[PDB]
Amino acid sequence: SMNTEAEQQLLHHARNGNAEEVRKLLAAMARMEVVADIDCKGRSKSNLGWTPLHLACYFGHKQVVEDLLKAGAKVNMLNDMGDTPLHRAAFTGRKELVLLLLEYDADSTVVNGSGQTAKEATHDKEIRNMLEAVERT
């Protein structure tokens, strides 16, 4: 398979936190001026198996995560490690991102390829508490 040009650009801008460029792409996508799946997965060594949402969560590009979620990105996509975007926001200890993802009904129960949930991946005690609360629901 392959990714379109617009998809490569979306992965690049999401990864690097270029929020304005992400939004320009999302607008062009919404009116079908370009072809791109917001849930595309990277195909180069720099992003293999990750979505724009994965990249923005892991590198902590907050505005990008928001914009992607408002535009309809799927919150429970998996990368090749079985991680969700919640796994990678929790792992990197980004409290506001974990909270934002929960606001979009992120599944807190997903077990990744290492046998861990997002609660088990984090180090920040606040995130551990938030995820513990959502698990029992």
Binding footprint of other proteins on the chain (CB under 8 A):
19, 23-24, 26-31, 33, 63, 67, 70-71
Residue 69 to residue 61: CA distance in whole angstroms:
13
Minimum distance from residue 62 beta carbon to other proteins (Å): 12
Minimum distance from residue 28 beta carbon to other proteins (Å): 6
Query: What Å distances lie between residue 42 and 99, 104, 113, 133, CA to CA?
Result: 25, 23, 18, 32
* φ/ψ of residue 48, rounded to 5: -65, 120
Minimum distance from residue 32 beta carbon to other proteins (Å): 9
Minimum distance from residue 57 beta carbon to other proteins (Å): 18
Pick the closest to residue 77 from 50, 44, 45 (CA basis). 50
The total number of residues shown for the chain amounts to 137
Our CB check for other proteins shows the closer of 7 and 67 to be 67
Residue 122 to residue 92: CA distance in whole angstroms:
7
